[PDB]
Amino acid sequence: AEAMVDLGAIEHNVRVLREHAGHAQLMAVVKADGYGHGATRVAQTALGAGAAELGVATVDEALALRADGITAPVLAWLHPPGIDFGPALLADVQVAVSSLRQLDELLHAVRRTGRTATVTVKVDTGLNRNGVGPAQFPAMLTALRQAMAEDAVRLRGLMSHMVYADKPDDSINDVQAQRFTAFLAQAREQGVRFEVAHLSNSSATMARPDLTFDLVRPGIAVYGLSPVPALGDMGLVPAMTVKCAVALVKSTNLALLPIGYADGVFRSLGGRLEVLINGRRCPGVGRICMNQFMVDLGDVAEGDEAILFGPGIRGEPTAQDWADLVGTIHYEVVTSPRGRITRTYREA
Amino acid sequence: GLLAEAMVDLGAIEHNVRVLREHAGHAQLMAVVKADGYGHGATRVAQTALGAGAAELGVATVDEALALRADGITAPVLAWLHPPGIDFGPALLADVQVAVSSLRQLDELLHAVRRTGRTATVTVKVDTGLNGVGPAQFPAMLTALRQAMAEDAVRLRGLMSHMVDSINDVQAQRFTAFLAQAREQGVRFEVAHLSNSSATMARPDLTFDLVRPGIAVYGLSPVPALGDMGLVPAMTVKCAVALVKSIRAGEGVSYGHTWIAPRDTNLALLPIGYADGVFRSLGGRLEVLINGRRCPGVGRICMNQFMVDLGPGPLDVAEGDEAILFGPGIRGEPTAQDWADLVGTIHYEVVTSPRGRITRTYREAE
């Protein structure tokens, strides 16, 4: 079994996203090991296709990209209490801070390493998770101005998280942008200029160009998965195809597929999913086991290829179809395949 | 792993193996460590189970068996799921026992015996109602094994089947018929085994020479309706609290704002999500244990984080404090079975889920 990532599709999706972003620079989001597609290979491909920067949640993710030889800018924005920012600084990793405590921790690491931090501030425009709130932003701006005066930080970015990953027309997107503009006015009042400001995820990138600031941060759309499923594929091509070989044929006629829920085939797909074998759809029957399940063939031989999901070009189910059956989202579908499902690549 | 961990208590594994050996009576135990030890770590659990009296190990694939061998495991290892056209040579050269479930597979194994010159320690997997050799094909299987055994191409170690209520008695009766058909055709196996964890613990009258528990080794109940059956779940999934914050009544939480605070309250941010194995459908249903108190999840589970409600009572949580998502339940935390109930699955799938930011760690047995 394998989870075949078509880097040609990644490259195509990156090119589509850049058309929508217009003059804005694109930050390809490759957290969670490239949403299960492989952070390093997707990153290399996106940068080749015109992405300017990479975005990840954790410094650990950023250090992994650096260790694989990535030299492009990388921004990390989720830091657990206790983190040592020193390794990030020595590896030229940009850090988004979301509290004065995080800033103070970063500054101690700047003095320790002797390395000026390229810093972004993450503010709360409505998600209400971890961004700096409006009342705390002035104090943060003052501390940043002081630190920048002593050449301890370079003030690169202002960023915020969108509330809706898939609801572009909701006026909360417009509200969050108005709130973001207000934060920028607060900075002006404190004599601070950020190099760039960014709020857009994939949904906002493709559908709200009127809310684009200096950079866009698409993730899901890089992998070809529609950020607004009710609109169809949005001209993207899902990059991941999950397939496995028929391990046994047994008589109707059934095929044994040797992957199961420990490999990420959601157990709740039992008796509901279909797979594509030699052009035809074959429904799963019976439970998904830990490492195998059966499908009903109703012209198939041991070793033949069964496709569980993909872009849909050959009539195979899509990750969205799995999301529909399971009651989830394709984000969770593509971060599931593992174990016996080996990640592979189709070169572009 | 500082951020989050799936901590496996090897003292619990030892206790569970001891319990299983008690139930197995005179029979020996094959501890089943397929799927990287049901998410607990095949090698570490294998080492601990053998040290607690397990006689042998069971896995699905030869690849799993080779991984144990490469980590220095020398005990017997049996593999029973093989892709068509497998070259059994490496298994024979690594002293991996092979269970065959078809005549075609036996032919593949006997070819590998001819190519390598290594006798195979063979087990036949028969179909008692569940793959497997069927009654129709078994007479031809026995004639061939008698032939291979006479030239010492194989050592005839095992006869096995897998259990799929009187249906249990029916499979056992079919299994005994296989043993009789082999005995009357003069083909003797060293050992016969039918029993998984459920049979081992609940149907001792159906114990043959060996039992093959998996799930109960990890302390998870093989008959959940009967309770913990004296076993202790070995996996505890826990994470450090990354942020504590206050919110006002009326404020939304997490992507989509699917939860609106009915009152001013305090929340904690736990930095693991569905890409780490926290099923997204647990959103708004699961509870965590923090400093002895249950805290419900609020809002959607995100890719790598979610939020829990600490309540508006005096704050008793700090950043860096420990949140327990599930465990054996000794401290009042949820169990893997609780998760299985909430999302409509089985604990087998729960414990094979944690990954990503959830680092597997080990507590040594005292």
Author numbering:
A (entry chain B): 14 to 264, 283 to 329, 334 to 383
B (entry chain A): 11 to 140, 143 to 176, 183 to 384
Pull verbatim passages from the article behind this deposition.
Alanine racemase (Alr) is a pyridoxal 5′-phosphate-dependent enzyme that catalyzes the racemization of l-alanine to d-alanine. Alr is one of the two targets of the broad-spectrum antibiotic d-cycloserine (DCS), a structural analogue of d-alanine. We demonstrated that Alr plays a central role in DCS resistance in M. tuberculosis, and identified that mutation of Asp 322 to Asn (D322N) confers resistance to DCS. Kinetic characterization of the D322N variant showed that this alteration reduces the affinity (Ki) of Alr for DCS 240-fold.
